[PDB]
Design a protein around this ligand. Structure first.
Ligand SMILES: CC(=O)N[C@@H]1[C@@H](O)[C@H](O)[C@@H](CO)O[C@@H]1O
Ligand SMILES: CC(=O)N[C@@H]1[C@@H](O)[C@H](O)[C@@H](CO)O[C@@H]1O
Ligand SMILES: CC(=O)N[C@@H]1[C@@H](O)[C@H](O)[C@@H](CO)O[C@@H]1O
Ligand SMILES: CC(=O)N[C@@H]1[C@@H](O)[C@H](O)[C@@H](CO)O[C@H]1O
Lengths: 88, 93, 104, 85, 103, 92
């Protein structure tokens, strides 16, 4: 749907202004733990097409990560995702 | 700026096209437009091979005259910017 | 971050050995696309649903490879060259220059 | 200074990535010079005196339209329209 | 060009003050110069008066534009010789332009 | 540079102290310096002033107080770091 503006960090297109991007889909924030246990945060824009899958994510992904999506102007900033429990 | 070019096709009979005239140049999106001339030169005798439009090309940026700057080529070429800029062409090695 | 993107490539016709064949241009900026397609696939990667699923499957099972960084938008250039009979041919070649890169 | 804005043409000489910060308003301005050559510019405006600047004078000799807003980056795609010719 | 800080190193030899100032040999003073346009942006730290004057200039240019001047300055230490050739230490206030604005 | 050696040859006229320690204060993160100023009469050093000196590009990243100018009527050096003006030298 919208003309949606999102913050981007780590996923910025090369023509981003003010670390923002525009989309017809969603803003996202993601916390992820790499294969060394270092945790990083990233954010950006996601196309509407395929967003059901990406916002859901797989609970069986090998690395710990949580993605959260929203559809309000720069709503990206208020997203504070938390890593899921370690699989024992 | 470049909306039309001089057109020439020496192979017009074989290609079943036109031989001489004007060619309108169409661009992309906000790509530049250019004209070119290409010719042979048998000891001062100029034989035009082709003239027409030329797509956005960094080698043709801000060249208002059509000049071949290479040393004694076997097929001479120049491209330029500007309406009908391929109408007259020169050689300066 | 070493993510899928456009990279510089100037195609110099001398370096390919096409100097005698191509009258113009002397070479051109082709570019190329390279880099990892991470999860999630961001809007500017213009991914298909399939690339999205494959990215998700890869994160579960590493034996399934990641999606691939390729050109998703390209533009044309004019070329002047000599044929078999030593005659000058003019062509506008489509899809010669990478304008945008994405995950497919 | 709690507000972040896009700036073009009105950047502080130390602007980081066409961004400025302020306690007042973001603005965009379209202005037509003498020949009809119109330009667009934007930036940050201090709260003090903003009443005057956001209002502008309709008796200005050059035609222009300034628009102000008070949310982060509300500035980036603001393109006001010149006063009725 | 809009109101801003420009370079200016004051070399005491150049102004003929080498005989009088023992230190420093000179200093970056800077200066302010350039147009004060409508609107006056945040970093120009304008008064209400300069804003009103800018708007009045817009309506009739017989009224001058506001002017570009230092709005923040810093001090320097100087050592110099007085009328009796005795050395004097002084911190001079307001010697160096740190910021420019419209007033 | 939190402190410097202080000297004022003019103390009796100025109604100040002659000699001691002077704490150096500076602005919003600007550097602080010490300085020495003296006269050399054929080899007999006569100190005129020592003290704190405000942020000055000519004193940046200097640990020693050396007068490098050729035989001046009044010698001067400035430096960076605590009490750096305690000892001063001359290398033209
Ligand atoms: C392709 C071709 O034969 N060219 C013709 C040209 O002769 C003429 O000027 C016009 C209509 O006849 O436009 C066509 O494109
Ligand atoms: C290519 C062209 O347009 N003409 C050139 C001309 O400049 C030159 O005087 C002559 C001798 O080099 O050769 C060609 O005839
Ligand atoms: C200024 C100072 O510290 N001492 C110098 C000393 O190095 C030099 O050899 C001599 C020359 O006359 O006396 C000077 O005063
Ligand atoms: C004139 C003057 O400032 N004298 C001061 C004095 O006030 C201070 O109590 C003492 C300790 O430092 O000696 C001097 O430094």
């Amino acid at each position: 749907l919208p003309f949606l503006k999102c913050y981007c960090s780590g996923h910025c297109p090369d023509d981003a202004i003010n670390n923002t991007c525009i989309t017809n889909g969603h803003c996202f924030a993601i916390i992820e733990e790499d294969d060394q246990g270092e945790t990083t945060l990233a954010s950006g824009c996601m196309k509407y097409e395929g967003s059901d899958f990406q916002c859901k994510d797989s609970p069986k992904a090998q690395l710990r990560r949580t993605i959260e999506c929203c559809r309000t102007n720069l709503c990206n900033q208020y997203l504070q995702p938390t890593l899921p429990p370690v699989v024992i | 700026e470049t909306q039309e070019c001089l057109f020439f096709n020496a192979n017009w009979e074989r290609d079943r096209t036109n031989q001489t005239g004007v060619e309108p140049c169409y661009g992309d999106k906000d790509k530049r437009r250019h004209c070119f001339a290409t010719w042979k030169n048998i000891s001062g005798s100029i034989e035009i091979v082709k003239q027409g439009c030329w797509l956005d090309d960094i080698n043709c940026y801000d060249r208002t005259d059509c000049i071949e700057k290479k040393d004694s080529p076997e097929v001479y070429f120049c491209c330029c910017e500007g309406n009908m800029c391929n109408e007259k062409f020169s050689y300066f090695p | 971050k070493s993510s899928c993107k456009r990279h510089p490539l100037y195609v110099d016709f001398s370096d390919v050995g096409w100097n005698d064949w191509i009258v113009a241009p002397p070479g051109y900026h082709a570019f190329y696309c390279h880099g990892e397609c991470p999860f999630p696939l961001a809007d500017h990667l213009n991914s298909t649903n399939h690339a999205i699923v494959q990215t998700l499957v890869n994160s579960v099972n590493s034996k399934i490879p990641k999606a691939c960084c390729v050109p998703t938008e390209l533009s044309a250039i004019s070329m002047l060259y000599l044929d078999e009979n030593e005659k000058v041919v003019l062509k506008n070649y489509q899809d010669m220059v990478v304008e945008g890169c994405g995950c497919r």
